Amino acid sequence: PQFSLWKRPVVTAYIEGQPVEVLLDTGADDSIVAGIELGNNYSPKIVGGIGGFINTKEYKNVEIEVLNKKVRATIMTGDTPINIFGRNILTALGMSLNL
Amino acid sequence: PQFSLWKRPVVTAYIEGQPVEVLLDTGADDSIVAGIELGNNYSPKIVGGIGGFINTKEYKNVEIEVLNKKVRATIMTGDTPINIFGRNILTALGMSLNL
């Protein structure tokens, strides 16, 4: 798969079986999703960007199906305006930025 | 060129001849740089990030030289911890996200 960047590179991912629409984001160091309940086993963390920071819950070894692949990665849940799949996941998938 | 996403995809760009280090950001709709003065023909813009909104100065038709290409694009200026090149520039450069 190749994504021109005219539109936002958004895809459907399933996180612990729940479909979510996510942004493939090379500028994001971490992955953060909203509207999913991941349970009790997390660590309270913070994540920031333009405009400041937000509280998050960090989950490890989360099952993810996306772009026809199956991976386990660290995902944060928090009040993000858009769901993000950052470098942690992109790397696991073998995705690259090319010119 | 190809960028594996193990490290942040950061390159040197010259903005109206001035060198700056920029992050190639598929998740960003706009481009925002700090610490270059681009002059007085700007219009103020409010831009939203993961943690909040910031005030920016938007400049149009800025000459950019990056990855051996020359483009003219819109650039905002404001307090960003990291200089970012978003989809507006990535598109004009002809970059893609591939898997």
Ligand SMILES: CC(C)[C@H](NC(=O)c1ccc2ccccc2n1)C(=O)N[C@@H](Cc1ccccc1)[C@H](O)CN1CC[C@@H](SCc2cccnc2)C[C@H]1C(=O)NC(C)(C)C
């Ligand atoms: C998701 C985060 C883990 C991620 N941040 C980082 O990876 C990160 C790295 C180093 C840092 C150093 C100091 C302080 C913060 C740092 N944050 C991030 O926000 N990345 C940004 C770019 C970035 C990198 C570094 C620092 C700051 C910002 C993302 O790619 C682009 N981002 C994706 C989330 C949307 S949410 C914004 C919004 C509001 C309402 C509705 N819809 C959208 C906004 C958009 C963005 O920042 N876009 C620009 C740059 C155009 C403002």
